[PDB]
Design a protein around this ligand. Sequence first.
Ligand SMILES: [Mn+2]
Ligand SMILES: [Mn+2]
Ligand SMILES: [Zn+2]
Lengths: 197, 197
Amino acid sequence: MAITLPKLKYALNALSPHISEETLSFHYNKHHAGYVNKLNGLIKDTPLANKSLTDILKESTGAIFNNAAQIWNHSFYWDSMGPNCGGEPHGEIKEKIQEDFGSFNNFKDQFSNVLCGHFGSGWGWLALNKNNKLVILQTHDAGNPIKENTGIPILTCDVWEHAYYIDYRNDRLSYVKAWWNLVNWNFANENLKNALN
Amino acid sequence: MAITLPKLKYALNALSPHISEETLSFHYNKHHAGYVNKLNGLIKDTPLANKSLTDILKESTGAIFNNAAQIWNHSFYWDSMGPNCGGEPHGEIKEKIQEDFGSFNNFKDQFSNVLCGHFGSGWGWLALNKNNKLVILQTHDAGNPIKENTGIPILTCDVWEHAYYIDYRNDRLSYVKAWWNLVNWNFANENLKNALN
Ligand SMILES: [Mn+2]
Ligand SMILES: [Mn+2]
Ligand SMILES: [Zn+2]
């Protein structure tokens, strides 16, 4: 089985007006697909040729790692959002956030601050750390908490300029605000359950 | 004198269709201006408050350096381009590129390769090294050859996504091709002459 672009769990216009169908079209069909295509080009006729994405992520370095990790990161980004989502958390993730951050609003303010403050290309993460505490992390470029052994990812938000430039230009703040309307708490709950078990 | 945004030496539509009017307006009036404004905000009421950009570049770290460096980098980028420019080099820079790269075409293909393969936010540089040889360099985020002590800058091209996303989206290759129509060989000659003297 060749490594492939996993399917979005919703339509290309499903996140609008918060993220436009045009953005998803480029972000998914050009950027995300391109990472898959480029990785497959790089590993062809190498000892990594028949490896799974998981194996590649563990073993590889350089541009091979960068493309592989971007594939994984973008799939986690799509899964971290959806239609008829956003708002206040619910379920276990509501308990866990209010516990570890005091309140949802405290978390949301800190997470927004990190997303808005990140310099250059990268990612913001909600993750569960080794002490089973929720933490906010940020990574540069293709970095993530799995590769960096800093925690188990629960949610992520992309802050590469290509994630928002079409809809928001330089106004990353407006993008981050829009993103809270999309956050998939069901995905967070599933990741949290699996992370604790 | 407070640190200020240097004036552009050309109109905001002087580089179209290679770089659009809209790109210059966001890139200069929002991004570059923003680095000036953020720098000035950060040094206010600190020991760096009344320092010049030059002083701040040699002393500072973290966000302060990032903003200061980006101010310098963008000013260098605007000066590296112009209307009625582009094409084959001329003057001393022609001789120098011919010698150090064998030909203009070899330099151009290498520099294009470096500009296109750079992962994440960054810059490509033509620079004079300590052996008075021209070299191709790349830096991440706000990095530049002065800070990194790797060479004296001659020309630069911005490859942060915001430099090209408005006009080309993910197609950095088209942006890089367009940029060769803009490269200011007169600036390259002035830089090379000051660097050798
Ligand atoms: Mn992305
Ligand atoms: Mn820029
Ligand atoms: Zn032209």
